[PDB]
Design an enzyme around this catalytic site. Structure first.
Site: not given
Ligand SMILES: Nc1ncnc2c1ncn2[C@@H]1O[C@H](COP(=O)(O)OP(=O)(O)NP(=O)(O)O)[C@@H](O)[C@H]1O
Ligand SMILES: Nc1ncnc2c1ncn2[C@@H]1O[C@H](COP(=O)(O)OP(=O)(O)NP(=O)(O)O)[C@@H](O)[C@H]1O
Ligand SMILES: [Cl-]
Ligand SMILES: [Cl-]
Ligand SMILES: [Cl-]
Ligand SMILES: [Cl-]
Lengths: 284, 284
Positions: A38, A107-108, A151, A156
């Site tokens: 988002k 990084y995962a 969560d 998650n």
């Molecule tokens: N540390 C990570 N390692 C690998 N993939 C990640 C990581 N963080 C996020 N992703 C990927 O990026 C996507 C979007 O992440 P994220 O931006 O955290 O979504 P969000 O829940 O909407 N939080 P935000 O964007 O901050 O509002 C996830 O669905 C993962 O596929």
């Protein structure tokens, strides 16, 4: 004025392992995007000196402030960056410039457990008991740190290089009821105290989630499936669920003990780690 | 098999006012799109015989079923199509074909009250008291009909041709906590009974919302603004809010009576319609 001087690490880290060197964008090579959320755009990144691979999330101050979620982001970064556990997604640090906030993340590489669950349809008892052990260990550490919101839904949970669970912090900006209004807080005001009090009933609720998660791991879908909201609420509050025939007696025992209506009757995290079905099948 | 034979009207209506003529898509001219939601595409439409203007929403069976919200949609259509009130958005009927569901809706031409609020920054006492009267009348009718979920947030209120309020049913598919999982029900299972019980505490909660709404009408923002979720929950449960200096004594009296922590102490809908500040300033 909106302060971006978080109570969170911003010192450069030597990954090959009095004012100090601070992070800068020039510290990182950028690779392909890993995803868009988002408010965050996540990229594969590499710290140039150590060549250490990580994930860099870019957020934009203008849209954070427009949605009114900048203070929540600050709270998440301060909270998350002080958690140190093998099964919690590490937040190494942060920095910012005139228009952007940058989060330096572990990084995962192997996706979310939810995706793995959908690929395999369901998990066997060994992987299930191993995942549950890892989450119970992480949850014990979290209560030690008195963390606000927990969560452990499978969407998650990220997967590390060797398949270890990494509890993430997805959806941090959208805990309020959905709406088309600009700011992402206002819809909470319309929840009366009787309902908001449920969101503050937070302690032995991680034990409930642990039981639902163990069920979804073994069965492939959560246990309280109903056709409408009101039916679903009744199924949950009255704990009305059943097992497919293949679920073993030990699995049934643990899940049914975790899904007690009275929170007092739910086992402690220590009991989960000592449960005979867990120790029999967990590789950890 | 998924049944689309709803317990809801599907007979052709003569708007110029034994099996019967059923609606068909060929009954309507289609105009410009009015908006796109999560599952619906809404178009300006016109019934050809009467030339009556309305709104047609198209939903797609495949994505409804994929998200697991088809039974909820059926429930919303059955519930909404049996509500008959000048301030409730009318659902005239529905029909469907091999791939789509069509909802025939009252067209509301003047947007949402939330947008009007953002344009005017805030409402004067006459419009506020008039809106509150209309909503109290509609809510009394709804309790008579024992409707499940109520939502009178300003972004869920549409405006009729002469500026009358029309309570809509926005966001019907997203009452569960947000997530990236396919189906829009599963995340509820992770809420323990202690928390889900708050969502079933539903009676004198419309009185609470009425007070929050009256405040937001007059002030332009909701009363419990805080910087984080946990602070906000505390502000709400302890009813910690204040008024700007311009809010009048009568307005303060009604809002403070509606925002009592004990639901028993909140006034009945009849008392709201008889409140001296309401009758003094309401044109209805
Ligand atoms: N540390 C990570 N390692 C690998 N993939 C990640 C990581 N963080 C996020 N992703 C990927 O990026 C996507 C979007 O992440 P994220 O931006 O955290 O979504 P969000 O829940 O909407 N939080 P935000 O964007 O901050 O509002 C996830 O669905 C993962 O596929
Ligand atoms: N009856 C109507 N009259 C006028 N405009 C409407 C009407 N219904 C919807 N709209 C407009 O269309 C937009 C999308 O509506 P809608 O599709 O109901 O959103 P939603 O809450 O996501 N529900 P859904 O699409 O069914 O999942 C709204 O924001 C309005 O601007
Ligand atoms: Cl419902
Ligand atoms: Cl029980
Ligand atoms: Cl919080
Ligand atoms: Cl009070």
């Amino acid at each position: 004025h909106m302060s971006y001087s978080y109570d969170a690490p911003s010192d450069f880290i030597n990954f090959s392992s009095s004012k100090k060197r601070q992070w800068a964008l020039e510290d990182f090579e950028i690779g392909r995007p890993l995803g868009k959320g988002k408010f965050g755009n996540v990229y594969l990144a590499r710290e140039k000196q150590s060549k250490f691979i990580l994930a860099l999330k870019v957020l934009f101050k203008a849209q954070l402030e427009k949605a009114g979620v900048e203070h929540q982001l600050r709270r998440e970064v301060e909270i998350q960056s002080h958690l140190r556990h093998p099964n919690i997604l590490r937040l190494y640090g942060y920095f910012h410039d005139a228009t952007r906030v940058y989060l330096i993340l572990e990084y995962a590489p192997l996706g979310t457990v939810y995706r793995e669950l959908q690929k395999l349809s369901k998990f066997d008892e060994q992987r299930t008991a191993t995942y549950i052990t890892e989450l119970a260990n992480a949850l014990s550490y979290c209560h030690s740190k008195r963390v606000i919101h927990r969560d452990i839904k499978p969407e998650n949970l990220l997967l590390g290089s060797a398949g270890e669970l990494k509890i993430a912090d997805f959806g941090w900006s959208v805990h309020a009821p959905s709406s088309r209004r600009t700011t992402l807080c206002g819809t909470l005001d319309y929840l009366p105290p009787e309902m908001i009090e449920g969101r503050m009933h937070d302690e032995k609720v991680d034990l409930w989630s642990l039981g639902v998660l163990c069920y979804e791991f073994l069965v492939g879908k959560p246990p309280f499936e109903a056709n409408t909201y009101q039916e679903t609420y009744k199924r949950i509050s009255r704990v009305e669920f059943t097992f497919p025939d293949f679920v073993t007696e030990g699995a049934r025992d643990l899940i049914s003990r975790l899904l007690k209506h009275n929170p007092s009757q739910r086992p402690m995290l220590r009991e989960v780690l000592e449960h005979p079905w867990i120790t029999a099948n967990s590789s950890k």
